[PDB]
C-alpha cells in the first residue's frame, strides 16, 4: 500500500476557496511529479497543472491559472491544491496523481476528492406517491413509483418495503432542477400483490435527519 | 491541445469474445527523442483510473496477457482478446508526447443484449403534490436494449418541450438492459386546464413508437 490519498469531500458556496490535500506514502515523494487532473460530469478528463518536488515549482495549463493554486508541504510530503472565488462550474471530482519522469505515465492515483459547488440551503424532499391511473395491466406485473423531488444535498436513500422489495426496483440518477434535486424509483411487483399487499417506499435523506414513508394506494 | 477523440463511445461485447477500442491523434505522438507517449487507462464504475498500457505497447504490473497494444503516429488500438466481468468499464486513451497530456473521451466495455422493447408507464400528478400547486407528470420506460430511445411529450395533440427531466439507469447487472424515466414538470394551474398527456418512445424493437396515456 504505497499510495496518494486525498481528503473527503468539500461542500462550498459560490465565492469561498478550498485547500484539498494528497499525502503521499510509500514512496520517495520527491523522486516522482505530482500532477492534477480534474474530472467534471460527461466533460473531458481535463489535465490542470503539475508540480514539481524538487525545484518546489508549479506548471498550470493555461486554463486553471488566475484561482487555482499547488502547494506542498514537503517536510510533511503532502501535496495540495487551492482554489478560491469558487464558482458552480467548479464542481468535479479532482484527482492527484503521481507523475512518472522517464515514461510521462500516471501510474498511482489518488481516490479524487468530489468538490460540490452551489448555493441551496439544506432542504428536505417532498415524496409524493406514483400508483397507476386506472391504466389496466399489460402482462401480469404493476409498476408503482416514489417521486422525491425538491432536495439538497445528496444522499438519498429509497428501499421499497425496508429492503424487502429490491429484484423489480429501478432508481433513477438525481437530476439538478433550479438548485434542488429529484430522484424517482419504481417497484414492479406481481399484480396479485398490489393492491391486495401493502407496497411502500421509504426514503430517507441524512443531511436534513429525515425520513418519510409512503403507502402507494390506489388510483 | 492534442484532441485525442476515440470511438466509438460504447462497444457491446459479449463475455468470450475479443474487443478493440481504437484511438487517434490530433498531432502525431512520436517524440523529438524517437519515443511515443501514448497510454492507456481503464476506469471502473465508482474508482480512479489505472494503468494498463504504456508507450503503446508495453502492458503494466500485474494487467493480464489478454491486452495486446498496437497501433502508430496517429493511430492506436487497444484489444483485449478474451473478455472477461473483470475488466469491464471506460477505456481512456491518453497521450504525453506532447504539452499539456490530454485525455481521449473514453469507450464504456458493455454486455451485448438480446433487444428488449420498453415496458412503459405513465402517472399523473398526484394529489399532494396538486394540493401546493405543481404537477410533475412521470413515465418510466423501463428494462430495455439499446440505450438508445427518443421519448416525447404529446401534451395535449400538440408536443412540448420544456420542463422535461431525463435521467437514465446504467446497465442492470442482471438483465443487462437499461431503464430510464422522464418526468414533465407543470404548474398546477397549466395541468388543470389540459386534457390528453401522452408519454411515447421511439425506439427500434418497434416501427410504431411505443405511446402510453392518461386524459385528464
Known amino acids: 500500500q504505497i499510495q496518494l490519498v486525498q481528503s473527503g469531500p468539500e461542500l462550498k458556496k459560490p465565492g469561498e476557496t478550498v485547500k484539498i490535500s494528497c499525502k503521499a506514502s510509500?514512496?520517495?515523494?520527491?523522486?516522482?511529479?505530482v500532477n492534477w487532473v480534474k474530472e467534471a460530469p460527461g466533460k473531458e478528463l481535463k489535465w490542470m497543472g503539475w508540480i514539481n518536488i524538487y525545484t518546489g515549482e508549479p506548471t498550470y495549463v493555461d486554463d486553471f491559472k488566475g484561482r487555482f493554486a499547488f502547494s506542498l508541504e514537503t517536510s510533511a510530503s503532502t501535496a495540495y491544491l487551492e482554489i478560491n472565488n469558487l464558482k458552480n462550474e467548479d464542481t468535479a471530482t479532482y484527482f492527484c496523481?503521481?507523475?512518472?519522469?522517464?515514461?510521462?505515465?500516471?501510474?498511482?492515483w489518488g481516490a479524487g476528492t468530489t468538490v460540490t459547488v452551489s448555493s441551496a440551503k439544506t432542504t428536505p424532499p417532498s415524496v409524493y406517491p406514483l400508483a397507476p391511473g386506472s391504466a389496466a395491466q399489460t402482462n401480469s406485473m404493476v409498476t408503482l413509483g416514489c417521486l422525491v423531488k425538491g432536495y439538497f444535498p445528496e444522499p438519498v436513500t429509497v428501499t421499497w418495503n425496508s429492503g424487502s422489495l429490491s429484484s423489480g426496483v429501478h432508481t433513477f440518477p438525481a437530476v439538478l432542477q433550479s438548485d434542488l434535486y429529484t430522484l424517482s424509483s419504481s417497484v414492479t411487483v406481481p399484480s396479485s400483490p398490489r393492491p391486495s399487499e401493502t407496497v411502500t417506499c421509504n426514503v430517507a435523506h441524512p443531511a436534513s435527519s429525515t425520513k418519510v414513508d409512503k403507502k402507494i394506494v390506489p388510483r | 491541445d492534442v484532441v485525442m477523440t476515440q470511438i466509438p463511445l460504447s462497444l457491446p461485447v459479449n463475455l468470450g469474445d475479443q474487443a478493440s477500442i481504437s484511438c487517434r491523434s490530433s498531432?502525431?505522438?512520436?517524440?523529438?527523442?524517437?519515443?511515443?507517449?501514448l497510454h492507456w487507462y481503464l476506469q471502473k464504475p465508482g474508482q480512479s483510473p489505472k494503468l494498463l498500457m504504456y508507450?503503446?505497447?508495453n502492458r503494466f504490473y500485474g494487467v493480464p496477457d489478454r491486452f495486446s497494444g498496437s497501433g502508430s503516429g496517429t493511430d492506436f488500438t487497444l484489444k483485449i482478446s478474451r473478455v472477461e466481468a473483470e475488466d469491464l468499464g471506460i477505456y481512456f486513451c491518453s497521450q504525453s508526447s506532447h504539452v499539456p497530456p490530454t485525455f481521449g473521451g473514453g469507450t464504456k466495455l458493455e454486455i451485448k443484449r438480446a433487444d428488449a422493447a420498453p415496458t412503459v408507464s405513465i402517472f399523473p400528478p398526484s394529489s399532494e403534490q396538486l394540493t401546493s400547486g405543481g404537477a410533475s407528470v412521470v413515465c418510466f420506460l423501463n428494462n430495455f436494449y439499446p440505450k438508445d430511445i427518443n421519448v416525447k411529450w404529446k401534451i395535449d395533440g400538440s408536443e412540448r418541450q420544456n420542463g422535461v427531466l431525463n435521467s437514465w439507469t446504467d446497465q442492470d447487472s442482471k438483465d443487462s438492459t437499461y431503464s430510464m424515466s422522464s418526468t414533465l414538470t407543470l404548474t398546477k394551474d397549466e395541468y388543470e386546464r389540459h386534457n390528453s398527456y401522452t408519454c411515447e418512445a421511439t425506439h427500434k424493437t418497434s416501427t410504431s413508437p411505443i405511446v402510453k396515456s392518461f386524459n385528464r
Open positions: 498531432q502525431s505522438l512520436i517524440h523529438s527523442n524517437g519515443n511515443t507517449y
Open positions: 508507450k503503446v505497447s
Open positions: 510509500g514512496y520517495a515523494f520527491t523522486n516522482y511529479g
Open positions: 496523481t503521481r507523475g512518472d519522469y522517464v515514461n510521462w505515465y500516471f501510474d498511482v
